[PDB]
mmCIF file of C-alpha atoms in Angstrom:
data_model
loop_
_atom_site.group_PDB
_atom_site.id
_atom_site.type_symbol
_atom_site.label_atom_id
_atom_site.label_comp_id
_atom_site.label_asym_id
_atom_site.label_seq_id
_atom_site.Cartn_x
_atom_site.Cartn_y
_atom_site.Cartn_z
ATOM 1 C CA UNK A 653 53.490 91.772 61.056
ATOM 2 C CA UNK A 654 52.914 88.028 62.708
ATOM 3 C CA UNK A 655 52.766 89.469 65.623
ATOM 4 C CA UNK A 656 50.063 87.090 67.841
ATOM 5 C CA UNK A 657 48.847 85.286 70.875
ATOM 6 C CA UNK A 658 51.704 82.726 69.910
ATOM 7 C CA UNK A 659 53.836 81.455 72.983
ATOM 8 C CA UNK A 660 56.595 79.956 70.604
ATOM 9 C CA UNK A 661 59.453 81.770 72.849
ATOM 10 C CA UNK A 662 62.505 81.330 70.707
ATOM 11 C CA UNK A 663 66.012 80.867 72.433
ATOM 12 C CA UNK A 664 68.653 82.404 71.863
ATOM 13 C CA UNK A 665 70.736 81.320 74.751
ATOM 14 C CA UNK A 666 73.471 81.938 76.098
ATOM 15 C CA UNK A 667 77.135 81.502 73.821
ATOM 16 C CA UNK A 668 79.729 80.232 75.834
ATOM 17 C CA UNK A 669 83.172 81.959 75.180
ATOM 18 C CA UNK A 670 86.130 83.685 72.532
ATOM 19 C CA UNK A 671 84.564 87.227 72.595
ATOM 20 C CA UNK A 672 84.662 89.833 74.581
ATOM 21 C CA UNK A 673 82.047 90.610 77.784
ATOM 22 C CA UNK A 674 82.582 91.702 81.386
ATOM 23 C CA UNK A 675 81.389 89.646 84.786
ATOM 24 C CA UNK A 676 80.821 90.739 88.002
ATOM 25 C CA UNK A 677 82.017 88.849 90.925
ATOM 26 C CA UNK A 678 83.002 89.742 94.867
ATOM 27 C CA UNK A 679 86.169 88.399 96.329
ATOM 28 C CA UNK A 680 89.260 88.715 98.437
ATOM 29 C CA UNK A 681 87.678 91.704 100.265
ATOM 30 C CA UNK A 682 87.948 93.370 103.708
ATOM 31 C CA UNK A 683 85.721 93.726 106.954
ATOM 32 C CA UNK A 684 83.972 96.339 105.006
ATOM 33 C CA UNK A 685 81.315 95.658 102.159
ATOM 34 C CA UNK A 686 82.409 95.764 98.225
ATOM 35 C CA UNK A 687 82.145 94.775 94.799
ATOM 36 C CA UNK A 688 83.897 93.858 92.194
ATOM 37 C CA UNK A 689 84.296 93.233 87.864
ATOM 38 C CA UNK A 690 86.244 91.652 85.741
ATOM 39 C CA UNK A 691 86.363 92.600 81.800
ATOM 40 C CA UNK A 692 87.829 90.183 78.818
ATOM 41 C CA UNK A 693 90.469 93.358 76.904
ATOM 42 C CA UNK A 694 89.531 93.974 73.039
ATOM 43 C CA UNK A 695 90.274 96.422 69.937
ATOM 44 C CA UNK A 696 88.392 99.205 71.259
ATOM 45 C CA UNK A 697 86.356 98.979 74.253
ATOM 46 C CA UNK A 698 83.796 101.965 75.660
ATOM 47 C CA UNK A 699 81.164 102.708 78.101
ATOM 48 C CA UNK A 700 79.618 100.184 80.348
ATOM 49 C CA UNK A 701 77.193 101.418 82.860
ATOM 50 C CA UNK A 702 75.583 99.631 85.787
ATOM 51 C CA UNK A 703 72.438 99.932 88.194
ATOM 52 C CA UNK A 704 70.618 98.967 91.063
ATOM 53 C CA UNK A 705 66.747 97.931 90.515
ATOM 54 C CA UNK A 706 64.569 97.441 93.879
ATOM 55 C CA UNK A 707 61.618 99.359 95.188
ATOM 56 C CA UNK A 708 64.178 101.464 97.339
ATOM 57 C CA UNK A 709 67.792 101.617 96.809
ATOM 58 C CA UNK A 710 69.735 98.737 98.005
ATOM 59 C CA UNK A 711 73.359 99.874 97.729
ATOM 60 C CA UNK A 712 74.743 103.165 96.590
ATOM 61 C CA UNK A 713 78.791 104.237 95.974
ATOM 62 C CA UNK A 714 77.184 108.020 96.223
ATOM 63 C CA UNK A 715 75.164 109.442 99.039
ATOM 64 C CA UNK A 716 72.057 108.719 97.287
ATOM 65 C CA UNK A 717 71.748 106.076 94.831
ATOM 66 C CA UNK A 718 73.821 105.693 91.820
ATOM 67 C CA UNK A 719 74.786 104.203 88.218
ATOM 68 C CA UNK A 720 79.032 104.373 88.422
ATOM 69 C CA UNK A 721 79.617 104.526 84.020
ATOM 70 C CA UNK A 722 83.200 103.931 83.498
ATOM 71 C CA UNK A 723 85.129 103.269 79.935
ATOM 72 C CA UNK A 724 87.804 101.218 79.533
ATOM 73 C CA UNK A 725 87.998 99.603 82.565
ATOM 74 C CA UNK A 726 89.393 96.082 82.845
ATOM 75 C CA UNK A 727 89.736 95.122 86.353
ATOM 76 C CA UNK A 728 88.566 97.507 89.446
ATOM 77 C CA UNK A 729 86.299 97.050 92.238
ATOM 78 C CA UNK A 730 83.502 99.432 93.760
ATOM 79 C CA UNK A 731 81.990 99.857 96.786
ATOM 80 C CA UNK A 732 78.214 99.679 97.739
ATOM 81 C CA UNK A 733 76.163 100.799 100.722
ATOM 82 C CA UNK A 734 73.590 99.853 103.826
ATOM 83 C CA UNK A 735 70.452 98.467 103.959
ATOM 84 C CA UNK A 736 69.090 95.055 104.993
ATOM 85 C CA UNK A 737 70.689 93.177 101.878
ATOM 86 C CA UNK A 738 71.230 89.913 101.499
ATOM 87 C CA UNK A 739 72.014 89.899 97.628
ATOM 88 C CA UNK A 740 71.515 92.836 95.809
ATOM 89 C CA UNK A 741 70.407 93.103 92.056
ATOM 90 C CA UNK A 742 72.562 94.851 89.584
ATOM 91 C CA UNK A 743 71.933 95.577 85.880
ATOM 92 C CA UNK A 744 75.001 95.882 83.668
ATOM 93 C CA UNK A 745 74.855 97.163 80.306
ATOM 94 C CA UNK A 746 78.028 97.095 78.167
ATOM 95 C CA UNK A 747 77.852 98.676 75.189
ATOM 96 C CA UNK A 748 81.682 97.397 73.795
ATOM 97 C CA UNK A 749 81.616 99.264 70.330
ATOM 98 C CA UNK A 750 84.832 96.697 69.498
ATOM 99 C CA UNK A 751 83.402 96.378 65.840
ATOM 100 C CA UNK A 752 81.034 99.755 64.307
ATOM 101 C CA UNK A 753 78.575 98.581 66.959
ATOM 102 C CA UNK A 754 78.272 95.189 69.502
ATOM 103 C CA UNK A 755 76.289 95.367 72.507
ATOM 104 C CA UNK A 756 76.161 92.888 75.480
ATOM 105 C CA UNK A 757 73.240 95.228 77.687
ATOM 106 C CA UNK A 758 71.278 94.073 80.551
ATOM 107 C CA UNK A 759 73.112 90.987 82.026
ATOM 108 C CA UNK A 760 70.712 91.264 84.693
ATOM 109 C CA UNK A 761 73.218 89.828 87.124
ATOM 110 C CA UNK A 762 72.123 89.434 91.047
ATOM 111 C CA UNK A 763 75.284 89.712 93.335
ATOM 112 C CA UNK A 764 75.439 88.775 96.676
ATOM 113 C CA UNK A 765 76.874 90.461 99.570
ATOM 114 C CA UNK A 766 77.270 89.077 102.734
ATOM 115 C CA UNK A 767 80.577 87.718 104.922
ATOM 116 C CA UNK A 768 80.726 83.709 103.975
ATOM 117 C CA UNK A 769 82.748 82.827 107.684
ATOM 118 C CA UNK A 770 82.088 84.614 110.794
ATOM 119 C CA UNK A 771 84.786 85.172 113.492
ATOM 120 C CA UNK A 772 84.742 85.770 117.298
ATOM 121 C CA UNK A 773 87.649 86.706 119.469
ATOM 122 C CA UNK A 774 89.029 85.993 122.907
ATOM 123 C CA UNK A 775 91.926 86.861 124.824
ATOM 124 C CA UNK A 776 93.717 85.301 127.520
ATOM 125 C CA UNK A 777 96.244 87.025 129.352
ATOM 126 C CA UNK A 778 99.141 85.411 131.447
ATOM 127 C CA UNK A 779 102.257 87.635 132.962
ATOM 128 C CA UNK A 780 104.093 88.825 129.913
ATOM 129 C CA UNK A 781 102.940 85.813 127.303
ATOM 130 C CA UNK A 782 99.692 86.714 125.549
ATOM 131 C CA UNK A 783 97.612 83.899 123.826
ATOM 132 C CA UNK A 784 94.308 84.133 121.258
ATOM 133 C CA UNK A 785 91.309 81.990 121.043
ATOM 134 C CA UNK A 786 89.480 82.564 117.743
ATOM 135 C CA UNK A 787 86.073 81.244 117.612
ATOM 136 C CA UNK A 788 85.237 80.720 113.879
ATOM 137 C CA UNK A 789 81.881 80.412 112.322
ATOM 138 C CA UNK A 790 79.714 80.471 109.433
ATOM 139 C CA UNK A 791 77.599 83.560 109.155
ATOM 140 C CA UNK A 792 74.099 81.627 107.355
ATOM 141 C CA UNK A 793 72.731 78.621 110.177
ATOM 142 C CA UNK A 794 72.508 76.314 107.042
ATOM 143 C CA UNK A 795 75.073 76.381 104.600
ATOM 144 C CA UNK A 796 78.777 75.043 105.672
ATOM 145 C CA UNK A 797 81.961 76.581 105.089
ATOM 146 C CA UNK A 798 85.280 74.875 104.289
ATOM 147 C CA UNK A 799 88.519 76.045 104.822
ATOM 148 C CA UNK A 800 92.128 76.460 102.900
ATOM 149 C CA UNK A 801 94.405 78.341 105.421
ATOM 150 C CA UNK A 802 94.548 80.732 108.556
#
């Protein structure tokens, strides 16, 4: 046992790509809040859990808060919940089991959820021909947004 007051903090890091994980993203939604994950197919995949981690409960896809396991899932989406969130803080644990037993657990991965634009409305009537004026905005006062099509 060298176990000790020794700081040495060995890597590990990160390895880039050609096996099998999951990732977490949240895109091409609605007007209403979501999430989403993406998963890399295998042999034999299995349970992969996830979880908030806060002193109260950020999000929830239940009434209270809530975990969501699923197995063999390779691309869905899930919803979340209210409170004042800016970017929540989920903990996913994949246990793949493609070999007798691989683990990727506890990609401590913080996802954001907020709009990125914001958009205001007005209407102009005239007799029988009907026009919009769409105010567009970003939502944050100091990051910009750019734009590929309306």
């Amino acid at each position: 046992c060298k176990e000790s007051t020794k700081v040495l903090v060995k890597q590990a890091h990160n390895l880039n790509l050609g096996e099998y994980a999951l990732e977490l993203k949240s895109v091409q939604s609605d007007a209403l809040e979501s999430l989403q994950v993406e998963v890399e197919v295998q042999k034999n995949i299995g349970n992969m859990k996830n979880l908030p981690v806060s002193f109260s409960m950020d999000e929830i896809q239940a009434r209270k808060r809530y975990n969501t396991p699923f197995e063999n899932v390779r691309l869905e989406y899930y919803l979340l919940d209210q409170i004042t969130a800016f970017d929540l803080i989920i903990k996913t644990s994949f246990t793949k089991k493609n070999d007798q037993g691989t683990f990727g657990e506890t990609k401590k991965v913080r996802i954001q959820c907020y709009l990125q634009l914001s958009v205001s409305v007005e209407d102009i009537f005239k007799k029988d021909i009907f026009f919009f004026k769409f105010l567009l905005n970003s939502s944050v006062r100091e990051e910009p947004v750019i734009l590929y099509s309306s």
